[PDB]
Amino acid sequence: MVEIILSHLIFDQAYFSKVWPYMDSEYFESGPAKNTFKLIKSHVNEYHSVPSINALNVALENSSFTETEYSGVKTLISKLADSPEDHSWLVKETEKYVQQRAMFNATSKIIEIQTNAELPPEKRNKKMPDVGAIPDIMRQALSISFDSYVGHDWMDDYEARWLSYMNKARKVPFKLRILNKITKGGAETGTLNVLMAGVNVGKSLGLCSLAADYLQLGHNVLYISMEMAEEVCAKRIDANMLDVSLDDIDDGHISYAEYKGKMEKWREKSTLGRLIVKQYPTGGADANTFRSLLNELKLKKNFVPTIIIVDYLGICKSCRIRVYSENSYTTVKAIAEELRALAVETETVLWTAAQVGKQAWDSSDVNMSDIAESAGLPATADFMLAVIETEELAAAEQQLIKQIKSRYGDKNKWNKFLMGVQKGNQKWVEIE
Amino acid sequence: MVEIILSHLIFDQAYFSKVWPYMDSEYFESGPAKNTFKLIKSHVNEYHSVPSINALNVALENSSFTETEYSGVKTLISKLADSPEDHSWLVKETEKYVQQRAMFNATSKIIEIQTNAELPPEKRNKKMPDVGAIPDIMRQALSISFDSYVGHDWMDDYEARWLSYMNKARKVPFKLRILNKITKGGAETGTLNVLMAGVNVGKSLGLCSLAADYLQLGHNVLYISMEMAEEVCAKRIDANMLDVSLDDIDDGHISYAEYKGKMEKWREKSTLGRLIVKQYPTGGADANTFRSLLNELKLKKNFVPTIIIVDYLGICKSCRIRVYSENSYTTVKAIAEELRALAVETETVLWTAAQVGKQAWDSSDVNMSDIAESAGLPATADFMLAVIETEELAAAEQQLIKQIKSRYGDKNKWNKFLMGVQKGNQKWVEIE
Amino acid sequence: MVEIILSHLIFDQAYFSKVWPYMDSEYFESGPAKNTFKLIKSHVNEYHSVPSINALNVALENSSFTETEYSGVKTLISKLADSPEDHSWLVKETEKYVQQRAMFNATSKIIEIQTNAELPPEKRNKKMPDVGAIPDIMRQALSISFDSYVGHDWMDDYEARWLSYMNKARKVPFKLRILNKITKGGAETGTLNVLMAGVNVGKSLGLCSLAADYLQLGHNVLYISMEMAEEVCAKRIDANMLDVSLDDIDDGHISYAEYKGKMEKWREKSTLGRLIVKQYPTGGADANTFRSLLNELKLKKNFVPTIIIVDYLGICKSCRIRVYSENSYTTVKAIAEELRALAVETETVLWTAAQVGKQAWDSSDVNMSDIAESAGLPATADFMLAVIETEELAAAEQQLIKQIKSRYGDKNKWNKFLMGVQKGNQKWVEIE
Amino acid sequence: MVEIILSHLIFDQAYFSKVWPYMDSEYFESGPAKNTFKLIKSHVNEYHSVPSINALNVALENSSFTETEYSGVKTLISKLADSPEDHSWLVKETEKYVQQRAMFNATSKIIEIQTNAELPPEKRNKKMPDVGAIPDIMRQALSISFDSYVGHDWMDDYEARWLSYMNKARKVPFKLRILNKITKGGAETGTLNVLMAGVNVGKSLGLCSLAADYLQLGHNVLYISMEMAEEVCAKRIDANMLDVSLDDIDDGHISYAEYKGKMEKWREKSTLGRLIVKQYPTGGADANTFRSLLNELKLKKNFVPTIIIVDYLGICKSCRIRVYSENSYTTVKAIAEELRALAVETETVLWTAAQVGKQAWDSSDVNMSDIAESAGLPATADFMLAVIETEELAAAEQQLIKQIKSRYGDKNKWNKFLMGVQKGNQKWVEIE
Amino acid sequence: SIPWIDNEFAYRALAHLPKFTQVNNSSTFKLRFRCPVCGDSKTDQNKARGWYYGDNNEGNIHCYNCNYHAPIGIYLKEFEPDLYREYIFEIRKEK
DNA sequence: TTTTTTTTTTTT
DNA sequence: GGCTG
Ligand SMILES: Nc1ncnc2c1ncn2[C@@H]1O[C@H](COP(=O)(O)OP(=O)(O)OP(O)(O)=S)[C@@H](O)[C@H]1O
Ligand SMILES: Nc1ncnc2c1ncn2[C@@H]1O[C@H](COP(=O)(O)OP(=O)(O)OP(O)(O)=S)[C@@H](O)[C@H]1O
Ligand SMILES: Nc1ncnc2c1ncn2[C@@H]1O[C@H](COP(=O)(O)OP(=O)(O)OP(O)(O)=S)[C@@H](O)[C@H]1O
Ligand SMILES: [Mg+2]
Ligand SMILES: [Mg+2]
Ligand SMILES: [Mg+2]
């Protein structure tokens, strides 16, 4: 792709500003390509700017080449157009081309070194290095990546870092004062947050409560159900928002008039957002399905979700690993990594649930080691809270939430706090 | 019209947004078209953008297929050119083409399955699906219409949601009052309910009692026994319905006149469904087997069940995992998930039994952690009830049913109640 | 000179005793030479003696060779003769020939590796080392010599032992006196130091504390963070050095004036180094990328580090194994070897932080049978510490270090000591 | 091979006396070889001595052979040389040749028997054995071995066994009178011997003392260390051999002159062995790595040890266990079995040490029941010496040696004895 | 393996097969024959896609029509048992 | 070579 | 008119 590289060197300043630092005559060819690049390099050295086609042709006329090389250079120069290709693909492809040409040159160099070594000392050339220089030669040709950014400096960039301290746009408040207190301003965008507990303890209850709280704050919430139906989860959201009950909905205690009135009153609010509930069969979805779902949602409706709730990571299906290719520690961690990558790509707060092994299903406390699936999930996670319910707690309708992995704030400042879980309304209530 | 599809995938952003989510590699050809689409798909997966002609040529040069394939792809790429078109004709024509190709691939796979199953065993080229899933594949060939359902909106779609609360066609009431009270109207269609008792405590007596109670309430019941004969289960049902002890049948204390009179008296009652008992060898039936049984029941016997009962899920075979490949956890979780998928597919109340661990036997209390073969079964089950029998309870002709996983209501309320199991009549009676 | 080598292996004894343990079948061409050497090696393995001409002609007849191979071997055996020469030119000539053959084999292997790498996925060979493994192979071939050291020979290697007694390696001192006590003056230059710990217990806290301590001693520190943003690591460093809590920075308790004043006060001190934080995506950086970063730091910023710090070993790329090719143990061991090679090449103290297994989490004591990803890390590492802040050390604002593998001194002298971890300032204080 | 066999029958004595009883005419051929062997056998029968070439030619001249037979025998006789092959290879190869020929003859005979069996009963040979004799005939073909040594035959090897009891062929002395007294002449080859150290006793002091004592007696000692480097172990060896205190070397009191003088004084003595110290990482050396180390030492260093001393049994890793627990019973039992198997298969005295039980630590008396390794070490250990160091013994520079398991002799003969431990020179001296 | 006895035995076994041709150059031994397993091409009666290659370590038969590929010993064991008996016996005769 | 479920067993 | 692994 030498023609593309030369064309975007001449006709693109952004490409020239990221590739010219790392470019040599040895990288291109031994024929017209090398001569064209040599003309470009000579012109940029004599005059610190990217040459044009007319200037390049004038320089070619000034420079001296044999007939074949002159014809080759003229033909190659004739073949240059703007062709506005993508910048990311262009830089990746030119990095690959540079790496492969450098590897080829290094292999030829070490082969020449080996051939010269076998020659008698009188015949051998003293310019070529000894065989002991073979490894590092092959190593400097493996460190030619395109990266001009060196990183922070802590003394030359403290002003920029202080300005970054004032960028709180990543934070998303919780609508619960205790959660904001323990997260130092709520959850952050592009993070994998997990709410783990035992079986039939209220994981989906907590997920729906978070969805309702984010909906009442004006966010766009995408609830992805993996076990329940769309109407069942929407019933829990209705119980949270309208605040009547779960049984009263199914027992007819709510007259249509009241339901319509409450729904229209919530519609009148300008602080309300949008909630979309999507159901998938067990073991049939991941970020690859989630990305297509995101694109379809954005196309069909003006819906770009700020919060993405996954009913359970375990029920989800990994992208690369098959359904039962490897064990739990791998594919579960792979799904966790894929979900975190999706969240950081979409810049959205990702919430999911996790199961706890049978050892802590009836215990007053649960630790991080009590994760039913892979322990890599409490490595990709950022705010892994835990829900613990006992008989005394269920008597007071107060689930205990223990801070298990706290990346935002101090995990041990408020380690265990009581919530006011109302199971009929599918709502978490703060305790004061 | 593969050339047009590829050209408008390249030179049309609007076309790519709708058709891409659905385009697949098996819809074009076995030659240049498939290779070009694979190049485009790889570029999209690597850069999340539509490749240009230059990018396609670069990827073509960095490809390993032979000279014929290279020439075909080069010609096809050179022939790609944008044309003045209209979004509608292209989307409809692409939908027609994709549907036709899906049907063609489906019928080719159907022919392959038929010609593979008609081969001597141990030479049938395993990993090929059996004839049983011949129609289902065709059902997948018809569910491709460029109309993916984005999901359910909480505020936009709430009239349809409200027209699902007083419908109540999802719930199937029990006959015992306590079970209706704890489940708030009975079990729901498309669910998986489980009984955990142990060994020789109940757990098939309870299933037979449920089958009899549903049969009395005008229901079509399909009992599936993986560990007992069709006549033993029918004998249990006879003892339940006719109020004659199993000992009386064994000892011949009931005459043919009384048996005939009771059977005819039950037959003449309008409030009575049809119960059908089917027996499979242990480990020789799966979800696909049950679907085949459902189809042959609908056709041959015009029998459409709603209360499908499986004696033990642990005794069934997974329809996806090879036997004895994965451990008990994964296999049992997969079996339970497949059974729940079958239940939601045919919209029936699915009832099953599950063993407890050896440590729970002869214990006054059984916890959810005492589940025998998998911890995933409680996670993938709508309702579970634990049957506990001690010496004192046995002497009182009673059993303690504990609500272990209650997805239809709050399990803390009415967690433990005493049923009046009568083991002679294979019947559950209340104490209220 | 294969014929001479075989002739003097058969007909000479001192030559056989000197050169046999280093000869290999790969050093001979695939013609008669390799087959003859195979016969000789099989005879030596079966009878522990040098075969004669009759023995080999018997072995040739009792062999599964084609007509061409049989004729070639017979001709080569016939051509063998005992040419009288000197047993000082033969040994050196054989060593030269073996070195040349090893270099030739390494060159062919790296050419095959480069050819394999350029192949597209799903067609390329697996278990074949990637491009980044090329220099290491070339380092092995140059190490071939007829001199081998297997173990330390008393009374034969005692000058070197006396040198080891009298001489001590240079040490880069810590700022914590306890680490100097347990390391006899600090850590050496070409070392790989690991600080294992559980999830969310202070892996990055300890590494940032070490980075701050080294920065206050005038070292150039490079912090390669594979999980956290550059601003986050630099904020940890600021909290360590400016004596301001992370809560104060996030809440805005400190003003820009105080921050600037403290930064300038630190700048005016002559005993300060340069700390540069570089962030890479998870799995996106390897040893070669680190070498490229070092090259650009030296060229564009005049920066040569000494205390290179990698946030997490388990996230970095293998650089020797293709992604998702081998198991976790092999990949992590390869990463450790690559990082130690980089540290030796750059003469930089390299510090990292691996993750312990789920068992070691919340465990009051840990050992070498607790490393999650790979148990081969201690073998590759030069100093390994642990963090045991499980249940009550957090309440007391303390920690614990196990000293799992200490090559600088003796691990069973100060094996367990208490560290005063302060999480607000992200530092370690001593209990003394 | 027949030419070699005949040549070394004519021109050798040990080969003749070894292979003549197992030599038959039917083993050679039906042509020149058979005739030559018949001549040899006739000459040896008429004159009980090996014939010479001239005598063989005279016998051939005075023999009844045709022209072709005469030519073949003459050529074969002229083709026999007195070349010197090694005896072991010659015997093994002629045994293989004889076995192959016997098997071929037996197979041909049974085929001929079967062919004769399928013939008219009136028409068959009477001399041919019946079909029922086929299994016996093949047995006579399989019962052909130049030398029969399957195990130890009582009443058939009593003279060789007595030479073992008088020559003490298995015992290896200790250089300590008390240890020789309780072992009836020292430890035995192919044995595993362990030392049990109570609280306050080092495990490597006793092992280094034993290694030094064996070194002074002329034995090749291989010391494999786990928790220590080669230099440290060799420094302990130097302390014991050169009489220099261990701390004096580190302080620098002993100069290079005295060190070199003592080392050369030891080297002058011809009663000194070789000590090879090899270091392995903790848990990175199973008893299969030791086999590779022995193979490398034999091939490269020509060092075949008679004593192998492993620094610590617990630090080692069990083979075929795939696990390395810090202190687990199953691993210790497997490690002991593997090390004893290595000792048996290498005919070497193997030494190791373990820690006694905590109760054994507190109690001066140590019971086999009071051992950290219970039923695992006092089951695979030929000798288990127990070392007790109390306050009173330490004040007197002594350690109480107790005999906990003695396969060699009676355990209760001399169970308790006081040993003069010097912790500075790492030495054991006797007590009068 | 023993190549020349495989060439000798294979020839007789493939001699019965029609369209039998001895493709023997100066350094190779090959036998062309109609495949007995599938009858070779049904449309073309004159095609001989069955081949025997005896120049390797083991003389192997390969069919280019029905993709049959086997050693000469398995071919003799499955199709010519009377020839298979002497074939495995003559091995001991020369070895 | 690790990882995770379940079971069964045994040792301390 | 040949071609395999
Ligand atoms: N024929 C019978 N007559 C009287 N009582 C019976 C009879 N069969 C079973 N029972 C009683 O019913 C109880 C439970 O029976 P089941 O339902 O078969 O138990 P089970 O749990 O299904 O057995 P498994 O181990 O799950 S196959 C037994 O403990 C007996 O007391
Ligand atoms: N229809 C209902 N009416 C009242 N309470 C209910 C109802 N359904 C569930 N609950 C309560 O909700 C609690 C836990 O709710 P769930 O969301 O089912 O917990 P979860 O099982 O972790 O979430 P899942 O498995 O993803 S549905 C149960 O213990 C019940 O007390
Ligand atoms: N913003 C913060 N303010 C106060 N304490 C914090 C803050 N962030 C983290 N911590 C504490 O720092 C501890 C150690 O965190 P880390 O340095 O990230 O350890 P870690 O091993 O790197 O965690 P990983 O990388 O997710 S396994 C946590 O357990 C918290 O208690
Ligand atoms: Mg649940
Ligand atoms: Mg049953
Ligand atoms: Mg970290």
Residue numbers in the entry:
A (entry chain E), B (entry chain D), C (entry chain F), D (entry chain A): 1 to 432
E (entry chain H): 3 to 97
Sentences from the paper on this structure:
The T4 bacteriophage gp41 helicase and gp61 primase assemble into a primosome to couple DNA unwinding with RNA primer synthesis for DNA replication. The domain architecture of the gp41 helicase resembles the bacterial DnaB helicase13,14 with an NTD and a RecA-like CTD that are connected by a linking helix (LH). The gp61 primase is composed of an N-terminal ZBD and a C-terminal RPD that are linked by an 18-residue flexible loop. Here we report a series of cryo-EM structures of T4 primosome assembly intermediates.
The primosome map 3-II shows the gp61 primase bound to the active, planar gp41 helicase hexamer. By classifying the primosome particles based on the gp61 primase regions and refining the entire primosome particles in each class, we obtained three primosome EM maps. The three primosome structures are similar, but not identical, to each other because of the asymmetry of the seam present in the gp41 helicase; they differ in the location of the two gp41 helicase dimers that bind the gp61 primase. The gp61 ZBD and RPD bind the gp41 helicase similarly in the three binding modes with the ZBD binding to the first N-terminal helical hairpin dimer and the RPD binding to the second helical hairpin dimer in a clockwise direction when viewed from the primase side of the primosome. One gp61 primase has two binding sites on the helicase hexamer: the gp61 ZBD binds to two NTDs of one gp41 dimer, and the gp61 RPD binds to two NTDs of a second gp41 dimer. The two NTDs of the third gp41 dimer are unoccupied. In each binding pose, the ssDNA 5′-end emerging from the gp41 helicase consistently passes between the gp61 ZBD and RPD domains. The poses are non-equivalent because of the asymmetric helicase structure due to the presence of a seam between subunits A and F. In our initial primosome structure, there was no density for the RNA primer, but the density for the ssDNA was present stretching from the gp61 ZBD to the N-terminal lobe (NTL) of the gp61 RPD; therefore, this structure may represent an ssDNA-scanning configuration of the primosome in search of a priming recognition sequence. We suggest this is a DNA-scanning mode of the primosome in which the primase ZBD scans the ssDNA sequence for a 5′-GTT or 5′-GCT primer start site29 (step i).
